[PDB]
Symmetry: D2
Subunit: 113 residues, 4 copies
């Protein structure tokens, strides 16, 4: 039913870990995905605002920092705004199902629980 | 132009088996056990439906990075391309994944990530 | 390298088939994907502007109409605008690799070439 | 919670084999031949690399819709979920696709689509 995607990229900044009145934790961060080339590299670019919640949000929070190369699988969510202030605005966000630091150019010590 | 790609989440059946080709190129093997949930629309709660087993081989330094970072039953995210090998009996084809990116899922766990060094 | 997605939904309107000075054809259309429910259906929603080019653009043009339920595989492309007129705008579009009418609630006569 | 999903583009090895379960539910089988391109970075142009063969089974009216709409070598788009069956020799597992949506690709062809009737 939903539209899902996988985006590989680096966090543009440390994950903002804020809490809701009810206590549940929410982690926000935008992944910036940037491509490859030939003969000379680099181009394209894609910045997707993401949000994970619950314990995954705190793990994201305590396990990721700026520049971190991540793998993110989630659901695209989009909202459509105004006209009574200007004229047609669209925004998009990714509800993260799973995310983890990528092991393509690095390592990590994974501690269970 | 492009291969068929998939993102599979699951657990490592066993630690990554790191070997090296004759030329020296590293190669890590493992299989992800992706278990989907099923809901008995009548009592009980969610259930562990039929699991999928996908063997995956990652190459070069990524593989070495795997061998040194992931272990048994670790939950991981795998983005890769489906490749159909061919092994003979005694015809036979089998479908495995060639990893492009893989990382530990921060779902039920944390991780200390050490960047390597390039840019 | 690129970020790809698959969106199943219906065209919100017939595909605009316009041509470029050079002659190549371009088909534009926005797919509107809307979900399922339980116990009572319907919710969510996602509208993604798409564009196919070349012969696929004309085939899309002559094979699809409004309401058509399609399957679309492409690449997300996003651009970031202004600040010298207002303050930060983001837009997204799907460069369609493959698209075809879905056979979930219909049929179609496929004529080769 | 969710299965592993994939979008595979390719051609039908053969016309869809439509059969019916004992209860009456329709079932169509077929396999997509997805051929990826390879570039000899030295002369020649693009090349037809190693193809992937995935068997797919679609259900109910969708299947009937398949049987009545698709034929041999037709290019199609398939969105589905990977399912691992189990058949025994003489153990054995195999990976096939359970289609959720499938349609003829308007890449190298057109199509006349007849909506059915619901909403
Ligand atoms: Zn090496
Ligand atoms: Zn039926």
């Amino acid at each position: 039913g939903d539209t899902t995607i996988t985006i590989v990229g680096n966090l543009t900044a440390d994950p903002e870990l804020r809490f809701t009145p009810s206590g549940a934790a929410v982690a926000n961060f935008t992944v910036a995905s940037t491509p490859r080339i030939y003969d000379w590299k680099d181009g394209e670019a894609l910045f997707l605002r993401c949000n994970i919640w619950r314990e995954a949000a705190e793990n994201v929070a305590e396990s990721l920092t700026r520049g971190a190369r991540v793998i993110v699988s989630g659901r695209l969510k989009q909202r459509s705004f105004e006209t009574r202030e200007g004229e047609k605005r669209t925004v998009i966000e990714v509800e993260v199902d799973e995310i983890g630091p990528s092991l393509r150019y690095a390592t990590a010590k994974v501690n269970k629980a």
